[PDB]
């Protein structure tokens, strides 16, 4: 009769499942050194599974079917996927799955977070032909990602151009997207930066033109967002009128200057609803007190002493 199952494998010691609706698998990455439901997930089907959440597990090296997310094809109707700190996974293999099957009729939300820095992934827009006398392979990025409301890619080594291509191709829909998290992605650079490789650039003007109605942005740990780069957001204020909640916290570069002029041009839109700058060592205390006093933000968080961002349950399902 079980519809919702959670397992939190705190420690280690040494076919159809139509009933199920939500599977949450959470592991202590230090203690757990394999993948518990590996056989079950690849062999079985869970055809009514709405939500899946796998964190802290370690994918086997001996099984490219696991590493290529071949099992993940098993689960249509999968309204949300969250996947985080799965140490031997890669976003590259995931995007290779997304290229070559209409795997999901509908994802409302996607959340992928690899931990260690794998090499640069660019959006693999190559559409090969077996012969020009034969069809080019239909690339399923659009119909797979067309549905998304929440896209979360924190820490995932996605290149800035890959995300622009997701928007220029309109694989990401925009008219339905509401919350975007790209924090901790070292391969993002903004247009004003003179130092780059061109395919790491994010064209925020194109992106914010595409997906204008979004509510919630997260750029925390995005060290590349220096004060100069924030100028790109200032001039693209007209395209983010839906934005209510802005997380840019734990940025060790961003001075209060950029914060202030961003909120001031945003005020030309009525405060921003909420803003997070916990741990941002460079925002001057008097500036954020001015932000409160002149009421440019309804709520702003400035817990300078907060060392970390992964609030369990709220921000992350990576264990402890």
């Amino acid at each position: 009769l079980l519809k919702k199952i959670e397992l939190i494998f705190v420690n280690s010691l040494v076919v159809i499942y139509s009933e199920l609706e939500k599977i949450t698998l959470i592991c202590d990455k230090k203690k757990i050194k394999n993948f518990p439901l590996c056989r079950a997930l690849l062999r079985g089907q869970f055809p009514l599974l709405q939500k899946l959440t796998i964190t802290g597990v370690t994918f086997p090296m001996n099984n490219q079917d696991i590493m290529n997310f071949q099992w993940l094809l098993n689960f249509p109707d999968l309204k949300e996927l969250w996947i985080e700190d799965n140490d031997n996974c890669e976003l590259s293999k995931f995007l290779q799955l997304l290229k070559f099957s209409n795997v999901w009729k509908n994802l409302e939300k996607l959340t992928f977070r690899e931990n260690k820095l794998y090499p640069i992934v660019n959006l693999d827009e190559d559409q090969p032909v077996t012969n020009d006398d034969e069809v080019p392979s239909m690339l399923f990025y659009k119909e797979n990602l067309q549905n998304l409301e929440k896209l979360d890619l924190m820490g995932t080594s996605i290149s800035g151009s890959a995300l622009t291509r997701l928007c220029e191709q309109e694989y990401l829909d925009g008219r339905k997207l509401r919350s975007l998290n790209i924090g901790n992605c070292p391969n993002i650079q903004f247009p004003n930066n003179h130092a780059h490789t061109a395919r790491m650039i994010l064209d925020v003007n194109a992106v914010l033109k595409r997906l204008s109605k979004l509510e919630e942005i997260n750029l925390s740990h995005l060290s590349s967002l220096n004060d100069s780069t924030m100028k790109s957001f200032i001039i693209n204020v007209p395209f983010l009128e839906n934005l209510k909640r802005l997380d840019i916290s734990h940025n060790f570069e961003i001075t209060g200057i950029s914060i202030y002029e961003f909120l001031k041009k945003f005020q030309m839109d009525q405060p921003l609803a909420y803003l997070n700058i916990d741990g941002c060592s460079q925002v001057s205390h008097i500036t954020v007190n001015m932000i409160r006093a002149q009421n440019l933000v309804t709520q702003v968080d400035c817990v300078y002493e907060r060392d970390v961002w992964r609030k369990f349950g709220i921000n992350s399902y990576s264990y402890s």
């Binding site: 931990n115 260690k116 820095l117 794998y118 060790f252 060592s281």
Partner: protein, 198 residues
Amino acid sequence: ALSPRTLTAQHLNKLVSVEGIVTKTSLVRPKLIRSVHYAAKTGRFHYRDYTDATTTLTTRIPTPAIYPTEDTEGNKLTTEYGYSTFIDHQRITVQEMPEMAPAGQLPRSIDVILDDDLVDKTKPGDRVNVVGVFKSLGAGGMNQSNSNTLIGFKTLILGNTVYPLHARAARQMLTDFDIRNINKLSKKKDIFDILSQS
């Protein structure tokens, strides 16, 4: 425009120009301003900025000059010199010119900080004009481990430029007019007598 005598506590945090003679130049040392660390397992390059009262014109929170050794996850870091950033740092004492000191008083002196390309622009005994921000730094005994009620705060000039002097410039600039006059005089038949009589 001041000297190490008439430079006064009213001038603190203002931009000042001081004339004097250099003495007691410190050794040149690299001052750490940024360190970069390869997290061996994680693959990312972490980094850390640093601050003290000399590196910045405003009193940013200090950073204890400690190198990282572990990631947030506990992964062992390795420090990357060559990507890490150090400025050259030098501390010099500018002394009041003895010709200016009033009757029966000895010359006053103040300490200047010089960074990067300003380093080694002077040696001791150079008469100089320094421009920089006059500042205070340190606790001044307000930290309760110091019982002494009366000691003052340390003060410095954070240097922005250094001009050597022999105005009554150490090396005089020569116009083409000066070049031509110098050559014209050299052809006068008794020029050695003219110059030595001069």
